Amino acid sequence: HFPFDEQNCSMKLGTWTYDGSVVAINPESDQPDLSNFMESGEWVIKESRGWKHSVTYSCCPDTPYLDITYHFVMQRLPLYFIVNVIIPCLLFSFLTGLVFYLPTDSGEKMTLSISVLLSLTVFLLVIVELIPSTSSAVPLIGKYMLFTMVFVIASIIITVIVINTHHRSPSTHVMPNWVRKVFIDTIPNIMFFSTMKLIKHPEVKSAIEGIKYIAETMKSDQESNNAAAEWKYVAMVMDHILLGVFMLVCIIGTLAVFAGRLIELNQQ
Amino acid sequence: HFPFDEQNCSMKLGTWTYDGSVVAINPESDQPDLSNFMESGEWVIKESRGWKHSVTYSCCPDTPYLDITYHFVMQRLPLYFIVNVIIPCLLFSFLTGLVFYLPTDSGEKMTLSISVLLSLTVFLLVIVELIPSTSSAVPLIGKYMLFTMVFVIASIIITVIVINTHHRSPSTHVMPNWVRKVFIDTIPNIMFFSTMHPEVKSAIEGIKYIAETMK
Amino acid sequence: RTVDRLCLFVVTPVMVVGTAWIFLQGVYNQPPPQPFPGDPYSYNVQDKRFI
Amino acid sequence: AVEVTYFPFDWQNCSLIFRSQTYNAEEVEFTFAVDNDGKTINKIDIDTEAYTENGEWAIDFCPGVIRRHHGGATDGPGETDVIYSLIIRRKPLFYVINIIVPCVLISGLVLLAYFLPAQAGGQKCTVSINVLLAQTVFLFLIAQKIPETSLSVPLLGRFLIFVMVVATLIVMNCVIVLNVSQRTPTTHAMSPRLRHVLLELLPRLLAPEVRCCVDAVNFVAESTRDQEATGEEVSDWVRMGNALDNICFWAALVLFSVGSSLIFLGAYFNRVPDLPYAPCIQP
Amino acid sequence: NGEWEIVHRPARVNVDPRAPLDSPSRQDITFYLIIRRKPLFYIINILVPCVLISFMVNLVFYLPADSGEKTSVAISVLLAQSVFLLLISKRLPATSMAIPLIGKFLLFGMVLVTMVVVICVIVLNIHFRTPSTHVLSEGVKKLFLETLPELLHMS
Amino acid sequence: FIENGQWEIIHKPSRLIQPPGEGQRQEVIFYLIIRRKPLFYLVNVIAPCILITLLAIFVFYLPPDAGEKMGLSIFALLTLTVFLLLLADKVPETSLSVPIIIKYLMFTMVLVTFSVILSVVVLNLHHRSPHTHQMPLWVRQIFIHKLPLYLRLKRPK
Amino acid sequence: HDALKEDWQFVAMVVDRLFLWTFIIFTSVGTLVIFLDATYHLPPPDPFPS
């Protein structure tokens, strides 16, 4: 649950060379003396208690071995890690979804996503120098870091796919019927509508045929532009869906990582 | 004056508990012994000298307190800081002004300026690793770093202004007369190398319309 | 675009296979079953060597 | 213990507590020494001639007090000690020159994004997101300096987080402006409500051959007409984006200036309190 | 230990037959520890991010040349790999017995990303050719417009 | 012997140093001449510098119309800055001479800086306004008639 | 206008190719010099050379 973790740290004290039959140790009080305890800027001691224990081995029934173990339950103060670690991660997670509201023609989607990733990569220095290097378990903050990194990578991949979709043209691809049905017809039916779905002289004859050629050429480019606009509309619909999905996944992951421990602390 | 700084560092030595009336200390020589001194790769001892001092206080006019202070005047060798710190900053400073030779139509003015700023920002991490961090005064290397950073920031601001001027549409924005007088007339003199049936009627109107649109 | 597609189909398998090879050397790296090569003994409390 | 709230514009209260390790107050007691004039030296003495000030810390005050306590019947034998309170002030010049001023300038750069065009070559998001990247580099730089306690947030960290939030908001706003400006008639519809709000209300509030040839000419003319109307609706979209940029620049400038000013003015009123003590080092 | 698991832990009496009996080096008792690293921290914090960031450079081949953000993506991946190398440089000694496995992967990925940047440069050079700059031969058209696309199942 | 993973012992002699010639003293000096094994720096510094240098060369093959020359060149400079930060932890701090690896690093940074500068020059030539800038005749004679033959650049038509 | 623009662009291309060859040459020479200086720096054959 780092940085919202609780730690039970013990200090076991005993006579190293004297057993219970020759030297007996008893606690002075049930709890450690905290009257002169200096305030800690990182930990709060919720509970502290000293317990005496006696252990007798079968091979040595007559010589019991005594110890006094003082335990301290400590709650980390998480404000430092919240400010320095969690909030930048949340900002990068929020920025991850904003690429899907950018137009493809801006020529800055990859710039935004790649720069968010570069910010996360520079932030890796901070997180690894602050997070402990242990493999007992994945820290919660480490889980959030991995979640954020994985979803910027996914956003970059899907943005590349969207940009490839936007640039498709009749000179390169032919629109499949299923793409048209799914994206141009079905989804707008469940979407708020805000987007549109002497004549014998050779020179004279050459001029006439030339104006005919011009008319046919611009008709052909109009048809090509219409097909390209269909591809662009498909890319735009995909981009709106992905904006919604990525914002929702950002919120859902942010809650699913922390809210359980936060509610556990709030309910105690 | 760092990395070109000179430092006068002293070593005051004295009998802690014995005053001058019971124990007298005298320098063996006027200078410290440097015969067996190991050469440094960071400092050069320009001067060295030992001075005896005697101090009498009002509360004890009969027990003078003696000391021998050995001072060493040393000059820093700046080649390490010149090579590792000054040369990168100079390279970034030179690259700062290149943006004004980069045309606006390239679409890379902000790429160059902002990335030069980013490189300088990472080199700030380098400088913080290499330069000592004190607040007694602003070192010369720190003045140069701040000058380079402010230089880059000013270049970015003025580059944004130039881009805004370049893209000003005529329909929305209109040229002031003073802009024309300053930049298109007076300034270009100093310098040079630049310059400055019904359907038949419908078809007729269409041809004239295309011509008017191109006009 | 044709060159881009060819370079995709050439470069991506190479990187995938190289990364898999490099990391598979590490995944199946474990210490030997015995502490000392050439010595069959395990040096474990389970296998006591009584006199 | 370092009070981090106004770091690096902070002052500290460091205690030096002296006591007998062996003897209680009934066995050994403390009194302050006296100067030549008989005045009690109830403070840390500093020889002015030999004193060299710390490169980062100035000693503003240093009173001393002899405390006696634990003298109750239940407590038993009385205890005593001597506590000196070094009130020390940080000289923040290094943090000002090397961290705060460059960070302030780089964080101010995002306001320039409002003046770049909302076109493919305008590079608005370039400026915004790369300023955010530079701020992340500054977060790494500041991680190596700030205290690691959690009783309060240091001023340097608070300012950095504030400028990161402002840069994120400006990135979102620039994305929205680019979305509005690039809208095409073939793909988006002309909303009259938004146009009226932004461009109208806001400024105030602020022979088959011959027939075939004629058909070809008419087709070219109508294509040109359609192009002109499409470009006019595109122009309307750019004007709406420009108006949005104009209002939001002032909004962002007010936000940045007010937040930075309040954060730094919190330190500006963080002087050492005027205690009823003489200065530790006489001038 | 939070990072190391003990696999073997033998104890041995070592006697050197060559050394003389009156030498301190004749006899010793050695207690060995064979310890395996638990790589979960390094996995989660370096390897998965580094591997995924390196793999993303293949996406540039699927980006169009008209996007104008191909070499930027590739060189940014190279920069991220360099940052990972900086991260790893602080954690191991500078020994020459072998290249670390993560070091081997980082070198391989950086070489591959450099090759990808070169390929992107060449693709962009080819894309922007015009009649006024280059001659499009019939052989090049035959190879790259008909034969290879049906070999590669391009649409 | 516990062999060092970074150092190879070339020579290991010992000598008796007599005084030069009442307070004079002999010495016994044990010398260790040791060669560093530089594999770490070859992997972590030299190869990245070579790769970045190759990219800096390949900037000049990028067409001006792509609008990407500045991005590649300047991000190569940024990567070199990151590697300077990498080296800052390792190199000696003395000032009697410069390490050759530092010399190579600054050579590479100067190369990348010149690549940026010359790419800016090329872009300035490419995007030059025909109506505003009149081509000098010497520019034509050198760069359109004489130089292209030597560079194997055959302008069509 | 297109012809003059094309002339300027061709001059830019020629200058770019010239700089490509110049960078190749200078890089090769400098890298070879530095690498040969590094490679030929051998340890001393004798611990006490004359």
Ligand SMILES: *[C@@H]1O[C@H](CO)[C@@H](O[C@@H]2O[C@H](CO)[C@@H](O[C@@H]3O[C@H](CO[C@H]4O[C@H](CO)[C@@H](O)[C@H](O)[C@@H]4O)[C@@H](O)[C@H](O[C@H]4O[C@H](CO)[C@@H](O)[C@H](O)[C@@H]4O)[C@@H]3O)[C@H](O)[C@H]2NC(C)=O)[C@H](O)[C@H]1NC(C)=O
């Ligand atoms: C953090 O970690 C520490 C351990 O490091 C935990 O400490 C344990 O605390 C529990 C109590 O919460 C201890 O249990 C108690 O032990 C007492 C002493 O036991 C010793 O002595 C008896 C008598 O000779 C022996 O039989 C025994 O084996 C031990 O040698 C008992 O007197 C207590 O009795 C209570 O429980 C029993 C059983 O329910 C009842 O019948 C009694 O009436 C009475 O209520 C009790 O068993 C435990 O021993 C501690 N362990 C150690 C090693 O100190 C902390 O609790 C933990 N903190 C948190 C919050 O997790």
Ligand SMILES: *[C@@H]1O[C@H](CO)[C@@H](O[C@@H]2O[C@H](CO)[C@@H](O[C@@H]3O[C@H](CO[C@H]4O[C@H](CO)[C@@H](O)[C@H](O)[C@@H]4O)[C@@H](O)[C@H](O[C@H]4O[C@H](CO)[C@@H](O)[C@H](O)[C@@H]4O)[C@@H]3O)[C@H](O)[C@H]2NC(C)=O)[C@H](O)[C@H]1NC(C)=O
């Ligand atoms: C680095 O820092 C050190 C320490 O601050 C500086 O050292 C000072 O050096 C100057 C000389 O350059 C010293 O001045 C000389 O001190 C001598 C000793 O004075 C003591 O002893 C005499 C009795 O013999 C007492 O009367 C006196 O009060 C002291 O107790 C004097 O003998 C010298 O006198 C000579 O010069 C004066 C000049 O006015 C003449 O009038 C005399 O006739 C005579 O020729 C002289 O005064 C000074 O004391 C040193 N200070 C300390 C604290 O050591 C270094 O100079 C500095 N290095 C730099 C910056 O370059």
Ligand SMILES: *[C@@H]1O[C@H](CO)[C@@H](O[C@@H]2O[C@H](CO)[C@@H](O[C@@H]3O[C@H](CO[C@H]4O[C@H](CO)[C@@H](O)[C@H](O)[C@@H]4O)[C@@H](O)[C@H](O[C@H]4O[C@H](CO)[C@@H](O)[C@H](O)[C@@H]4O)[C@@H]3O)[C@H](O)[C@H]2NC(C)=O)[C@H](O)[C@H]1NC(C)=O
């Ligand atoms: C972890 O690290 C420890 C060392 O710190 C390793 O322990 C070494 O393990 C190897 C292999 O088990 C040992 O090498 C073997 O030593 C045998 C005994 O040599 C001693 O006794 C003979 C008696 O005749 C003396 O002559 C000799 O000088 C020594 O005093 C040899 O008999 C073995 O030889 C066998 O293998 C070689 C090939 O390697 C063949 O050529 C031979 O014919 C024969 O088959 C062998 O040399 C070594 O002594 C151990 N070192 C110690 C105990 O300090 C662990 O193995 C290692 N754990 C790992 C890596 O898992």
Ligand SMILES: *[C@@H]1O[C@H](CO)[C@@H](O[C@@H]2O[C@H](CO)[C@@H](O[C@@H]3O[C@H](CO[C@H]4O[C@H](CO)[C@@H](O)[C@H](O)[C@@H]4O)[C@@H](O)[C@H](O[C@H]4O[C@H](CO)[C@@H](O)[C@H](O)[C@@H]4O)[C@@H]3O)[C@H](O)[C@H]2NC(C)=O)[C@H](O)[C@H]1NC(C)=O
């Ligand atoms: C690693 O570092 C050590 C030092 O730490 C080096 O050892 C030095 O090596 C040099 C060269 O071998 C030695 O210099 C030579 O010393 C000879 C003996 O000098 C002693 O004896 C004479 C007796 O007359 C005394 O006068 C003198 O003061 C010494 O006590 C000289 O005979 C040599 O002379 C040669 O060079 C001089 C120029 O310097 C010429 O004029 C002569 O004609 C002649 O050619 C010479 O001076 C030096 O003494 C060693 N230092 C020691 C032992 O501490 C290692 O060489 C170095 N290793 C490497 C590989 O770099």
Ligand SMILES: CCCCCCCC/C=C/CCCCCCCC(=O)O[C@@H](COC(=O)CCCCCCCCCCCCCCC)COP(=O)([O-])OCC[N+](C)(C)C
């Ligand atoms: C991983 C790195 C390597 C990646 C390679 C990717 C290869 C991708 C494959 C694509 C090849 C190109 C196919 C289309 C064009 C062919 C026709 C054409 O115009 O040819 C042109 C020449 O040929 C070139 O311009 C080749 C491309 C540049 C090569 C640069 C050097 C090698 C790579 C960098 C160094 C690598 C080593 C250092 C860095 C590691 C012009 O020809 P011409 O003068 O007009 O001659 C007329 C006859 N002809 C037209 C029939 C030819």
Ligand SMILES: *[C@@H]1O[C@H](CO)[C@@H](O[C@@H]2O[C@H](CO)[C@@H](O[C@@H]3O[C@H](CO)[C@@H](O)[C@H](O[C@H]4O[C@H](CO)[C@@H](O)[C@H](O)[C@@H]4O)[C@@H]3O)[C@H](O)[C@H]2NC(C)=O)[C@H](O)[C@H]1NC(C)=O
């Ligand atoms: C620098 O640090 C020193 C040491 O911490 C500090 O001096 C201490 O200040 C506290 C007050 O903050 C003093 O405590 C007071 O003592 C008097 C008796 O001498 C009591 O009457 C006071 O009681 C008030 O406060 C209580 C709080 O629990 C209330 O319960 C009560 O009703 C009263 O309102 C109070 O306990 C302490 O004696 C001194 N210690 C010394 C001088 O040795 C100093 O002020 C700090 N300097 C700064 C911050 O400038």
Ligand SMILES: CC(C)CCC[C@@H](C)[C@H]1CC[C@H]2[C@@H]3CC=C4C[C@@H](O)CC[C@]4(C)[C@H]3CC[C@]12C
């Ligand atoms: C391609 C895009 C969608 C990104 C995909 C990221 C995937 C591959 C990532 C996300 C979370 C990752 C897992 C997170 C943690 C662990 C536990 C440990 O055993 C290391 C591997 C393993 C099991 C990872 C494997 C790779 C993983 C599943």
Ligand SMILES: CC(C)CCC[C@@H](C)[C@H]1CC[C@H]2[C@@H]3CC=C4C[C@@H](O)CC[C@]4(C)[C@H]3CC[C@]12C
């Ligand atoms: C190819 C790219 C993703 C590089 C990384 C490949 C990784 C994720 C793969 C390659 C081969 C895989 C191993 C293959 C088989 C097994 C045995 C089984 O008990 C599951 C774990 C384990 C040990 C796998 C762990 C993950 C692994 C190491």
Ligand SMILES: CC(C)CCC[C@@H](C)[C@H]1CC[C@H]2[C@@H]3CC=C4C[C@@H](O)CC[C@]4(C)[C@H]3CC[C@]12C
């Ligand atoms: C996100 C933007 C708006 C704000 C950025 C600065 C952040 C870090 C600031 C804003 C308000 C601040 C909090 C305001 C008040 C308190 C109570 C105090 O007893 C401990 C610190 C604490 C809890 C502050 C921590 C830092 C804080 C959260």
Ligand SMILES: CC(C)CCC[C@@H](C)[C@H]1CC[C@H]2[C@@H]3CC=C4C[C@@H](O)CC[C@]4(C)[C@H]3CC[C@]12C
């Ligand atoms: C940055 C902008 C956007 C928001 C600023 C909000 C102000 C009111 C916040 C920001 C930081 C806050 C301070 C942070 C920490 C402390 C120390 C605590 O012991 C008392 C409250 C005090 C002194 C807070 C007072 C309120 C505070 C000054």
Ligand SMILES: CC(C)CCC[C@@H](C)[C@H]1CC[C@H]2[C@@H]3CC=C4C[C@@H](O)CC[C@]4(C)[C@H]3CC[C@]12C
């Ligand atoms: C693309 C996905 C798979 C992410 C990349 C995974 C890469 C980094 C590979 C390389 C080596 C792999 C590890 C090697 C061995 C094992 C087996 C078992 O103990 C669980 C998974 C685990 C621990 C693997 C997790 C994934 C792993 C770390």
Ligand SMILES: CC(C)CCC[C@@H](C)[C@H]1CC[C@H]2[C@@H]3CC=C4C[C@@H](O)CC[C@]4(C)[C@H]3CC[C@]12C
């Ligand atoms: C193996 C031992 C004896 C050392 C031999 C010297 C080797 C390592 C040196 C000598 C000449 C060097 C080459 C000279 C120039 C270049 C061009 C440059 O753009 C990349 C590096 C490269 C390709 C060098 C690689 C290393 C090299 C081959």
